[PDB]
Symmetry: D2
Subunit: 247 residues, 4 copies
């Protein structure tokens, strides 16, 4: 596999259908070495889930907590020499933020909660895994979405938070370059308005967890060492089109 022997930390694995899952699957296939984080009272749920990947570790990480992000690596450091990739599939906004007119919805707290879990956490990860990622063609990937680039209905505060992430990828790309660490993002399409997508986008379909999963994998390999600060769209083409109405 094009990821043989590399050590990768995969965040965001919650279910059978998680993008993070497609990622794990692609990576395991390419023979990487894998570790997983869970939030809250899902210790159970995820270790069951990721058993098939022969995990090096399954460790708590609520990116709300600074001490938890520290410990995550202190404990990872008991299992690994260093670290090759960090994959970042983390996002969240309160409900109240996510359903209605955006300026009706938006509240100070929601804005900073959403930004904190969805954008900063990526940098916070880069900070604490850096020391074990130096000079090894190390890679970092985030999961993002076109609501960053373009305003949409009800994506709301989440779209803003995503734009925030994208900016953060670019600054991390520059901060971590000297250390030879690439930083990039995959922009997925939806996995109930995936209908629109399937009708408009040139490839006439929604994408699946394997297509994204493989892109994220490719982006943590030695083939992708010329790329950094980049948003790759894995969205059947949706991004490069501008129809309006369909019937």
């Amino acid at each position: 596999g094009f990821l043989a022997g590399k050590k990768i930390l995969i965040t965001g694995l919650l279910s059978n259908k998680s993008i993070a899952y497609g990622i794990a699957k692609a990576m395991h296939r390419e023979g990487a070495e894998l570790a997983f984080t869970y939030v809250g009272q899902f210790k159970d749920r995820v270790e069951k889930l990721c058993a098939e990947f022969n995990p090096a570790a399954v460790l708590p990480c609520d990116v709300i907590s600074d001490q938890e992000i520290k410990d995550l690596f202190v404990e990872l450091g008991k299992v690994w020499d260093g670290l090759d990739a960090i994959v970042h599939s983390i996002a969240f906004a309160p409900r109240d933020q996510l359903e209605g007119n955006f300026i009706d919805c938006v509240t100070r707290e929601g804005f900073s909660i959403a930004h904190d879990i969805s954008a900063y956490s990526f940098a916070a990860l880069a900070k604490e895994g850096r020391s074990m990622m130096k000079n090894r063609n190390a890679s970092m990937v985030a999961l993002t979405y076109i609501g960053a680039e373009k305003a949409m209905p009800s994506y709301n505060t989440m779209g803003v938070a995503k734009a925030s992430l994208e900016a953060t990828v670019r600054y991390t790309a520059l901060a971590l370059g000297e250390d030879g660490i690439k930083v990039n993002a995959v922009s997925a399409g939806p996995i109930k308005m995936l209908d629109y997508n399937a009708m408009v986008s040139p490839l006439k379909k929604n994408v699946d967890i394997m297509e994204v999963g493989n892109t994220v994998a490719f982006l943590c390999s030695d083939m992708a060492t010329g790329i950094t600060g980049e948003v790759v769209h894995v969205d059947a083409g949706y991004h490069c089109v501008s129809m309006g109405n369909v019937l």
Copy 2:
């Protein structure tokens, strides 16, 4: 004046040199009626600074506080039937955010404050101004910078908070669209620290000035601009549209 009779509220006015000043100077020339805000103990400084614009009111609004933002409009509403524009010229990041490698500097608290002040506050003003701005080809404008788009040494988390601002600007464009409110932003180049680089690479071979920025905020608050929303206009001497690397200045020295 193309802004005649319009009631426009200006934020971020701190000095002679402030972008808001350029804005105001422009807006005043075009017959706008203007209000002003201040943060902290600047009632006097700012009252004396904006006397020349014959303000309708000068009002406390630290954008940190939900109460100050609500009380802003309750007050503004005592003097002004309704409201036409809001100019958002507000940026903050803790200095600890701005000195060196971005990953070295960035903190949860820094990131938080940065976005709170630099981006959220825009939506907050939209939230509390909205009712005063219903049905009058009303306008909001925000101020931004290319660091939103592309990474740079030092600008760091301010670069992110600006990207968050621009995203905020667009969502607001969609959200107040229904209420006839256009929402746009001006990306301004540096104003007299690397001005030099800007002035050497940029097509028009200069730095911009506050008039040049002011004049464009003016326009985007005019009935002439009512087809433009969610937009980022660069008033930056052309810097955005160009891709060079290092130029090569030639410093002469004389030693006696």
Copy 3:
């Protein structure tokens, strides 16, 4: 008005409903002196058409012919001692390019012609016009459409041409900045159809006009190489409705 005494060349006035007529109406109101180009056997229709703007000149110009473009300015230089702006509102693609699957329709010639009239002719105008535009905060503005930025059904070859056109804008901006000539483009949303954008309407020829006017004004001397969408926010939004029929 903010265009008082400025001398502006407007291309592509063909109709009572042309964008260039909105531009004209706007610029004239803002106190500019104006000159207009016509094509072939249309001298008279364009003469009747711009009478209301008290034109300084009505001169032939088929942007196909270098000779015609050189001749425009030679003749324009006889009436004016310098030029303040050029308005580039010219677009053409052969009909067979514009209707169907792009890879089905596209031809070498169509590709050639569309780019020639739609994109290059901007550079040609800059090139011949330049010497009368030096050091007076002069301006060039092209009309463009989001079909350049993103692929659309039927717009096809035109979309690529408009793309070529917005690069022509950028390079010109860089090439002519050193003379104070600001070079910019307005991406115009369509005027009519026969819902999507945040303003929930179609922009009209005045809104487009007033922006082109402002982009030839002294107020916009710090703006160049830029695209300004006057399209009611369409560019910044990504909702397509599906339309069910029951």
Copy 4:
């Protein structure tokens, strides 16, 4: 090899420093069968360069000639069941278009010559080779350069063309996706101070580009279409120039 048994066609291999050489190495390592184009008398040259990849075919193609392009696909059609990918690494501008102030240089003939070879030819290839690619998760990749997005000195007409190419990539993507064809582009960095400004502080090398282009013709890349992927040490995502001084010292 992630490209095993895919039939791919490679244009614009003119020497062993060509991007198309990087692509070829990448693709052959990934187990693809490859065919190559050449213009004019360069049959011999190109047959030598690529001999090492056991070309499935080596065939003439001047992208200026409609008829050469037709024959390209007629003949390739005799050798192959169908076709999996086309790699477009072809650019040309007249010399007079590239050495000065854009507006002084640019000409009607130049502008259109530049667009025909550098931009049209892509659609042109798509057109005539479409039929062999129908429904087999087939792919097209173009090579572009960041001067499509921004202006550089003297890249002039080429930057316009490359911009035009990039739109064509977008339209081809929509024209052809109904047949399952991905249509993308790699904006390569130059292979200096792109080595001083880029976050990764280096010039990307043909393998780094080749490997990417290969990936864009792998079955792993089936949800990516109409994209432009920068393989440029991160130069695109940055605004990082600074004024470099030379010191002149005069005594007394």
